[PDB]
Amino acid sequence: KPKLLYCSNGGHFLRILPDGTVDGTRDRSDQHIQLQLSAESVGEVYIKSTETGQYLAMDTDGLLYGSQTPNEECLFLERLEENHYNTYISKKHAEKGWFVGLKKNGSCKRGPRTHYGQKAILFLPLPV
C-alpha cells in the first residue's frame, strides 16, 4: 500500500516532481507525494511515485533525483527510530553518511549536508 513520507523538519511530504525534481510540499492533496515503498533485501527499500513511476534516487554528488528506472542509485536503507520515524540512508554512499532529507523550507537537502540525528532526515510514513 502507498504512503506519504512526512518530514518532521518542516512538516513537508516527500515529493517527486514530474520534472524529476525532488522536494517537499505541505499540501496533503498534492499528486506527487504518494509513494510506493517496496523492499529489496531485508532493511532495503525502493521508493516510487505512483503518479509517475519515478524512483527516488541520489546521485554521485549527493543530490536526490527522480529516476525513471530502478538502479543502484535507487536503493535506500530504511532505519526505524522508536518514535516511528525512519531514516533513509543512501545504500550506494552509506559510508559517507548520505541521507534522504528535507530542509525547513521544503527544499531537499544534499547528501554531504546530511547527518545522523538531524530533523531533516526523519520521515514518518503515513497512510494515503
Side-chain angles (χ1 to χ4, degrees), residues 1 4 12 15 21 27 32-33 39 42 49-50 83 87 93 104 111 114:
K1 298 191 176 169
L4 308 188
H12 305 77
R15 170 173 64 169
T21 294
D27 169 20
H32 317 89
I33 59 154
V42 168
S49 174
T50 62
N83 64 3
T87 62
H93 309 272
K104 289 197 150 297
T114 66

Side-chain angles (χ1 to χ4, degrees), residues 58 61-64 96-99 109-115:
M58 173 179 286
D61 294 323
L63 300 354
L64 307 165
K96 316 154 222 268
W98 284 1
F99 291 89
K109 211 135 189 282
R110 292 188 287 104
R113 316 289 329 193
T114 66
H115 198 282

Side-chain angles (χ1 to χ4, degrees), residues 51-81 83-123:
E51 194 76 9
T52 54
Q54 290 172 105
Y55 285 87
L56 183 65
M58 173 179 286
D59 65 35
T60 78
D61 294 323
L63 300 354
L64 307 165
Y65 71 101
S67 185
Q68 190 68 223
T69 75
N71 61 47
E72 77 193 314
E73 310 194 334
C74 311
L75 281 172
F76 296 94
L77 304 178
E78 196 190 41
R79 301 285 176 278
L80 170 70
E81 306 284 1
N83 64 3
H84 300 239
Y85 281 77
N86 296 133
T87 62
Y88 297 88
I89 182 158
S90 165
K91 172 168 175 189
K92 167 169 203 62
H93 309 272
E95 79 298 3
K96 316 154 222 268
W98 284 1
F99 291 89
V100 169
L102 293 177
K103 310 206 296 187
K104 289 197 150 297
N105 63 28
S107 307
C108 82
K109 211 135 189 282
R110 292 188 287 104
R113 316 289 329 193
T114 66
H115 198 282
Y116 187 71
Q118 295 172 342
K119 278 180 212 293
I121 63 162
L122 302 161
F123 298 73

